Design a protein around this ligand. Sequence first.
Ligand SMILES: O=c1cc(O)n([C@@H]2O[C@H](COP(=O)(O)O)[C@@H](O)[C@H]2O)c(=O)[nH]1
Ligand SMILES: O=c1cc(O)n([C@@H]2O[C@H](COP(=O)(O)O)[C@@H](O)[C@H]2O)c(=O)[nH]1
Ligand SMILES: [Cl-]
Ligand SMILES: [Cl-]
Ligand SMILES: [Cl-]
Ligand SMILES: [Cl-]
Ligand SMILES: [Cl-]
Ligand SMILES: [Mg+2]
Ligand SMILES: [Mg+2]
Lengths: 218, 222
Amino acid sequence: MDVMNRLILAMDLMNRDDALRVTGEVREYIDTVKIGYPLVLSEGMDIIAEFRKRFGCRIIADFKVADIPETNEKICRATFKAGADAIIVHGFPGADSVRACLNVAEEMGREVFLLTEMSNPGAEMFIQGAADEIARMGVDLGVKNYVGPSTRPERLSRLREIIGQDSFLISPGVGAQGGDPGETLRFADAIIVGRSIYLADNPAAAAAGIIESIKDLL
Amino acid sequence: DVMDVMNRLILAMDLMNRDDALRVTGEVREYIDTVKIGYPLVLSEGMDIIAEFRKRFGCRIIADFKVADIPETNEKICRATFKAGADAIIVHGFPGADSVRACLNVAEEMGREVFLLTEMSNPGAEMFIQGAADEIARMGVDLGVKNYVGPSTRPERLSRLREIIGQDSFLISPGVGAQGGDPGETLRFADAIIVGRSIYLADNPAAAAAGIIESIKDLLNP
Ligand SMILES: O=c1cc(O)n([C@@H]2O[C@H](COP(=O)(O)O)[C@@H](O)[C@H]2O)c(=O)[nH]1
Ligand SMILES: O=c1cc(O)n([C@@H]2O[C@H](COP(=O)(O)O)[C@@H](O)[C@H]2O)c(=O)[nH]1
Ligand SMILES: [Cl-]
Ligand SMILES: [Cl-]
Ligand SMILES: [Cl-]
Ligand SMILES: [Cl-]
Ligand SMILES: [Cl-]
Ligand SMILES: [Mg+2]
Ligand SMILES: [Mg+2]
């Protein structure tokens, strides 16, 4: 996947007018938008096609898919029907649940991203101890796209070691949660950035500033 | 007090088009006053489907969204979900206490309920979730969670979950029917069973529901 400026916008504003306006303000800087449940549950799945119509951007549906295989299949189908190019899936529920997502993605010409360790402090309780094994499970299942935490660069580096240089790795927790853009890009192919951009007084200047700080990594 | 689930039976309405979902739910309305609506239906038909169910049926709505994000995003998901009219939301515990707390805080503010999913019913649950489940359950109890979800497909596990959360906590359990769980045996430990396909794919969903209820007749409350 070829992400402009190695920067993915996490568009978690919850009203259509603001989400569209702010995305428009930063469109020159990005070509990849992560759309999650805050926006989708507030404005409907039609928002995905509308982003494509307005911006032509690729869309990653961050739905943290975490159900049994039968339900995971249905969620992936509904998500790809709405025009998402990729979907983010939890590994914690086990291999069968991940395989269910991989199957639908293959059928519809899309990608699965496997979330292995989360960026919140609570991730230390249960996920972190399973994360290396979840990553190896990804490798075993043929997963090529991964998500890992900007807030723990040593853990992000370990994830990169496990998955290899050929796999694609994106990383949230940059800015608001404390992660550094440049340090994160030592290990991740692309950084995910939400609030630092979409809640900034001037979102365009914020995006430009982040890009300036990583200009020698582009 | 806990939610009063008619016949101890919750419909998992995972049909993906509005017409079929509405028809089947209407067909079983005399048996079931509590419906679990998940992402298969919501992502296909929109959050207004919750409104439509409320309008058409006299049914409580549990939003099965397995909320599993960071605290900031979890809050937003819960707010949008309760705004749409869900009585309760199901959240994962494996992302940690902060993520669960975020949901509980919104539910408290908004006058709604959180259900904590501690273990899952799929075979894959043995890989990672099973080993964390007792601690996830204990964490729920420590956080003041009152409502829980655990798997009918593993009776010994469901029994242990009931022990951890105590008799006062409310426990619902999926995996009955299609996944192999038995209604009566599950109700030894769960307050209510969740049933999807063996009702909604039946030639006569009403007959299927009635049949499940007949098999557990002596377990209903006066
Ligand atoms: O471990 C993870 C996985 C995520 O998808 N995310 C998501 O990435 C985004 C982070 O946004 P922000 O830059 O505002 O912190 C949010 O949409 C969040 O749900 C995360 O923060 N941590
Ligand atoms: O561990 C769990 C947790 C669930 O919510 N579920 C949900 O319960 C329902 C089970 O439906 P069914 O009776 O068709 O197997 C589905 O909506 C599924 O997503 C489950 O099967 N296992
Ligand atoms: Cl399944
Ligand atoms: Cl925590
Ligand atoms: Cl957070
Ligand atoms: Cl498995
Ligand atoms: Cl068992
Ligand atoms: Mg609306
Ligand atoms: Mg720099």
